[PDB]
Design an enzyme around this catalytic site. Structure first.
Site, PDB file in Angstrom:
ATOM      1  N   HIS A 124      14.064 -10.600  28.061  1.00 23.37           N
ATOM      2  CA  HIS A 124      14.136 -11.353  27.078  1.00 23.37           C
ATOM      3  C   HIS A 124      15.064 -11.177  26.101  1.00 23.37           C
ATOM      4  O   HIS A 124      15.148 -10.110  25.610  1.00 23.37           O
ATOM      5  CB  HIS A 124      12.803 -11.827  26.550  1.00 23.37           C
ATOM      6  CG  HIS A 124      12.647 -13.168  25.938  1.00 23.37           C
ATOM      7  ND1 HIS A 124      12.843 -13.219  24.635  1.00 23.37           N
ATOM      8  CD2 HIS A 124      12.319 -14.355  26.511  1.00 23.37           C
ATOM      9  CE1 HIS A 124      12.917 -14.685  24.322  1.00 23.37           C
ATOM     10  NE2 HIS A 124      12.495 -15.417  25.527  1.00 23.37           N
ATOM     11  N   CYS A 137      17.559 -15.920  30.229  1.00 25.66           N
ATOM     12  CA  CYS A 137      18.700 -16.397  29.726  1.00 25.66           C
ATOM     13  C   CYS A 137      19.143 -16.088  28.302  1.00 25.66           C
ATOM     14  O   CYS A 137      18.227 -16.500  27.513  1.00 25.66           O
ATOM     15  CB  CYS A 137      18.869 -17.944  30.137  1.00 25.66           C
ATOM     16  SG  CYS A 137      17.708 -18.927  28.967  1.00 25.66           S
TER      17      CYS A 137
END
Ligand SMILES: [Hg+2]
Length: 256
Positions: free
Chosen positions: A206, A27
């Site tokens: 990431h 996210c």
């Protein structure tokens, strides 16, 4: 994904919140949000300890919708806001990211790229093909990552041996640059980043919050393991992979 721990730190002489995660998810919400908190564009009540996605999303929504247009792409601006808003809810869950190997700011455009561009946050990655190896340069070339995996598969099932050769030249490049950061990338990325600006750094699905300081790169310490460790804020990105030094809010050394 549900709840995140808030960590208060003395950023630029003011108690500033930062959001932590153990989960290490893909996210970009936290990467983006921490930048906004660090710029004091969102403020939290001093006592706050935990925060949900739906708050962060709310805070982000307001933030984007409160952007006044200020000089260039006019009909684009209004579509970009609408693009940003339509894709906004995806930022909690996760995100596909298709890098290009031609430069540190190079991706396949998806509308999620509008959120970064609106907020003035650079997105970078370090997966660059080396000029030194010019077979790999030729084999990869224009292509993005997800395009290169297609072409690799297409190159296996070709009968032409030129293509089948290049299908291995490329399959090598991904094998040898498996950790998604080359030495050439790190050099180019350092030179690219504006001193003292916040940005988002992409690597191995990431997103990290990144900055440059005294012409060295540092990433924010999102890790929840150091939630109590107020003195642990930035982590150096000096080497291609290996040992790294931690720093406090003012970029001075720190230990656990
Ligand atoms: Hg993107």
């Amino acid at each position: 994904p549900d709840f995140y721990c808030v960590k208060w730190i003395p950023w630029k002489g003011e108690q500033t919140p930062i959001i932590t995660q153990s989960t290490n998810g893909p996210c970009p919400l936290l990467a983006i949000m921490n930048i906004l908190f660090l710029q004091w564009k969102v403020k939290l009540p001093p006592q706050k300890e935990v925060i949900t996605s739906d708050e962060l999303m709310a805070h982000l929504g307001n933030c984007l919708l409160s952007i006044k247009p200020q000089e260039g792409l006019q009909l684009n601006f209004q579509q970009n806001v609408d693009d940003a808003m339509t894709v906004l809810p995806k930022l909690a869950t996760g995100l596909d990211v298709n890098v290009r190997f031609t430069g540190v700011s190079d991706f396949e455009y998806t509308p999620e790229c509008s959120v970064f561009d609106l907020l003035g946050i650079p997105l970078y990655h370090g997966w660059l093909v080396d000029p030194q190896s010019p077979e790999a340069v030729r084999a990869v070339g224009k292509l993005s990552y997800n395009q290169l995996v297609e072409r690799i598969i297409t190159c296996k099932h070709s009968s032409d041996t030129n293509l089948v050769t290049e299908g291995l030249i490329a399959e090598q490049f991904l094998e040898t640059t498996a950790a998604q950061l080359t030495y050439h990338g790190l050099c180019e990325l350092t030179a690219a980043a504006k001193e003292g600006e916040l940005s988002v750094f992409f690597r191995n699905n990431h997103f990290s919050t990144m900055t440059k300081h005294k012409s060295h790169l540092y990433l924010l310490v999102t890790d929840q393991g150091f939630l109590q460790e107020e003195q642990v804020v930035w982590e150096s990105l000096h080497n291609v992979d290996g040992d790294s030094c931690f720093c406090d809010s003012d970029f001075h050394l720190s230990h656990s």
